[PDB]
């Protein structure tokens, strides 16, 4: 049978959409919700049901000549302050920014705060 508790993420997403006063955002049949923010940033919310967490994932766009050592220092950010991370996806060759929120900690204000955090992290890298 279907584990109905896994609809928690959708319920949250509906409440978030209501807060944003917008047509409801939806998770697709891969458990993801792709969004464009401010006609500038690409962001995805992804439900990791097995690990009981929601992922916020963003497309990073560092300067072509940012030293890889700088990006690797950035990669430690989650350790330093529980903020967003970064890494290289080898399938696409694109740098990804990410934040994970355990199901236990999800709420509409937490999701809002963490999305803004991710966005500002993306903004900093793109213009560094």
């Amino acid at each position: 049978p279907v584990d109905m508790s896994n609809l928690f993420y959708k319920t949250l997403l509906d409440d978030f959409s209501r807060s944003l006063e917008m047509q409801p955002l939806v998770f697709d049949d891969h458990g993801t919700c792709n969004m464009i923010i401010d006609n500038t940033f690409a962001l995805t919310l992804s439900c990791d049901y097995a690990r009981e967490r929601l992922l916020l994932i963003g497309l990073l766009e560092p300067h072509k000549d940012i030293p890889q050592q700088c990006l690797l220092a950035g990669a430690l950010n989650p350790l330093l302050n529980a903020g967003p991370g970064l890494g290289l996806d080898e399938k696409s060759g694109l740098y990804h920014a990410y934040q994970s929120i355990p199901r236990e900690k999800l709420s509409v204000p937490t999701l809002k705060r963490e999305m803004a955090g991710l966005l500002e992290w993306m903004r900093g890298w793109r213009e560094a």
């Binding site: 049901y49 994932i57 694109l94």
Partner: protein, 71 residues
């Protein structure tokens, strides 16, 4: 019943839209290819993607069923 949500948090306002092919076309053209590649790969990023998609599809079917009960 607007497509463009306003996320307000910490003295900032962000406009959110769902990312369909239409909304991607509005990005600057020099931004679109990477955005498309990012979105295409995003749902496969996390380990166990097959099984996650099986779960997601089943949940969405249940949601569709609950709507039919009302109607």
């Amino acid at each position: 019943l607007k497509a463009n949500g306003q996320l307000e948090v910490d003295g900032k306002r962000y406009e959110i839209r769902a990312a369909d092919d239409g909304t991607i076309s509005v990005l600057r053209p020099e931004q679109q290819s990477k955005a498309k590649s990012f979105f295409k790969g995003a749902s496969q990023l996390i380990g166990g993607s097959s099984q996650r998609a099986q779960i997601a599809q089943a949940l969405n079917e249940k949601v569709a069923s609950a709507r039919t009960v009302l109607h």
